């Protein structure tokens, strides 16, 4: 039944609603200008500083301790999802593990996205919005942890994609049976092809005119992917240029790969 | 309607049959039994008889790159029996085979491979699996993960008619670098995604969204050539010849 698939669908969007507190549907209301919600934009040096006046050691290495708190965050955000999906916490618990260590960077990027436009990213929960240049100008290395990321969301925001899309999108990515390491591929696979037919029910219904979408964004796994493999090698060159920072522990556990 | 999808899948299938001389199905038919049992490469004595019948690491990494290039013009000949590609701006036409013919290089030698080994020189040999991964560095890890993707990509039990529109689709990829116009390339991969998935329906009935892992395998390619590529940087670490493969 398509029934079934709908209410799959339907299920997941309710808990990505209730897992990720910064939606789609609001980050594009507060980019496009929907009086209330407006960023206040960091662009230069005095900018940020004045920025701590109402948005939430070296400015560079700040805004990098930033990210990555953030990140850490949003790997929480991403394993409460997780958690959601039908089949997931039934699992293998090592499994469990292995699957959010390859799928939480891959939704990351998916949904920093959302965040996104050709001219800069949104912080702090939307509070503020930080330029695409001022981040671009950053101290060598950190100069071009960002550029990748904004390339691939004017790519992946021009498939159009809202929330409903992307519940069951990030689904589909953390359900992938092809993780290095896995014990019991062949149940993860089964629940992944339920998502993926859900997704193309989804997107068929939701997108009738935006022919082979789904095609289009499975594609997209790719780009993503080559993403965290560059990300990766930009990490280790921070680590050892930059002796004296820290990473947070969550985050080098994902890496250690 | 779906006729004019599948008038597509046929001409594309007849192509590649006239455009690739060892066939997959032919492949399989030598792998599994039944066409004399090819001459197996094992050992260091079974290469130096096998060229009699047909430094070491060296010479079967030059074969290699000697085969590459011949497959290169059987794919580009397959690329131009595809509707709308010799329509297409002359520069758009190279820089997708340029970007394209690694990832249908390692998408075909599939068909040739099994998790023991895989065929050579028309299919007239076989060069073990444990023999390759034997080879001295870095020449030993080289051929290694083709072999893990052929393995997971096979599962898949793909035929030449779906291959045949798969390979259309990889050459057709709009976000290959330099692109001058991507429009007609992608409204040219949509009617081949079209095709496929409509193939993949009639042709695998019981194999649930196989059109979904298909194009899931993208992105374990894009890896595969992305390492292969950064193999080779190592190796030119270690005359018109060099010209010739480049
Ligand atoms: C880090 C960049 C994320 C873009 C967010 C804008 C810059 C940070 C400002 C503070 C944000 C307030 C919410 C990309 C990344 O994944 C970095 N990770 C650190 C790591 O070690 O992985």
Request: hydrophobic share 40%; proline share 4%.
């Amino acid at each position: 039944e398509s029934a079934d698939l709908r209410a799959l669908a339907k299920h997941l969007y309710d808990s990505y609603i209730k897992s990720f507190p910064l939606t789609k549907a609001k980050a594009r209301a507060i980019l496009t200008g929907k009086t209330d919600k407006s960023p206040f934009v960091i662009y230069d040096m005095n900018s940020l500083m004045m920025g701590e006046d109402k948005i939430k050691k070296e400015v560079a290495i700040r805004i990098f301790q930033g990210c990555q708190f953030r990140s850490v965050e949003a790997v929480q955000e991403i394993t409460e999802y997780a958690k959601s999906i039908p089949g997931f916490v039934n699992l293998d618990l090592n499994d469990q593990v292995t699957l959010l260590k390859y799928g939480v960077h891959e939704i990351i990027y998916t949904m920093l996205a959302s965040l996104m436009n050709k001219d800069g990213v949104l912080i702090s929960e939307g509070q503020g919005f930080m330029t695409r240049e001022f981040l671009k100008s950053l101290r060598k290395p950190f100069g071009d942890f960002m550029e990748p990321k904004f390339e691939f969301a004017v790519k992946f925001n021009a498939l159009e994609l809202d929330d409903s899309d992307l519940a069951i999108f990030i689904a589909v990515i953390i359900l992938s049976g092809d993780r290095p390491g896995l014990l019991n591929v062949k149940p993860i696979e089964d629940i992944q092809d339920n998502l993926l037919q859900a997704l193309e029910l989804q997107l068929k219904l939701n997108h009738p005119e935006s022919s082979q979408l789904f095609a289009k964004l499975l594609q997209k796994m790719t780009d993503l992917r080559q993403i965290v493999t560059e990300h990766v090698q930009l990490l280790q060159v921070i680590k050892k240029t930059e002796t004296d920072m820290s990473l947070h522990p969550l985050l080098q556990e994902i890496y250690k790969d």
